[PDB]
Each structure stands twice: as C-alpha cells, then as structure tokens.
Write a protein that binds this ligand. Structure first.
Ligand SMILES: [Cl-]
Length: 90
C-alpha cells in the first residue's frame, strides 16, 4: 500500500474531471476512482484510476456510502484534498 495526499483545484465553471464508484467489500464501502479525464484538474493533481479515496479534507470516507461521498466532494467547492491509497503490480 502507498498513500499520497492530493490537493485538486478547479475553476467554478468546471468539474474536477474524475469518476468514482463505491464497492461493498466483504460490508465495508470503499470508494475508488474508476476514470480520470486527460489534462483535468484531477489528472494534474496526480489522481489515477484505481486510486482508493480514503479521506476528503481529513474526513475519513472509508465506510461511507456512495451518495454521501459524492455530496461531500460537491460540498468541497473548487479545492479538494484527497488521501489516496494505491499500489502497482510493476
Ligand atoms: Cl454526479
């Protein structure tokens, strides 16, 4: 497991440019990044597909349901701080 805190920043008329899904693991909800659009605020901050989002602005989002994490991120405005968890095979 690697861990990295990212800070994403966008303009008002603009999305962060990533998508998430929430998996009910065996139930512990884990939310991870399923897509990141190229050259988006997300990409530039270092966000990568497969990253688990463990925290949003120091809120532990592990165990949180999908709708709440979406609302949390949307409530964050234009600055978003994500603790990511990831690893690579190679
Ligand atoms: Cl949405």
């Amino acid at each position: 497991q690697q861990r990295k805190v990212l800070t994403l920043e966008k303009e008002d008329n603009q999305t962060f440019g990533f998508e998430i899904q929430t998996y009910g693991l065996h139930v512990e909800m884990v939310t991870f990044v399923c897509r990141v659009h190229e050259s988006s605020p997300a990409q530039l901050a270092g966000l990568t597909p497969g990253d688990t989002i463990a925290s949003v602005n120091g809120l532990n989002v592990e165990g949180i349901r999908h709708r709440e994490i979406v609302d949390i991120i949307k409530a964050s405005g234009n600055v978003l701080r994500l603790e990511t968890l990831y690893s690579s095979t190679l």
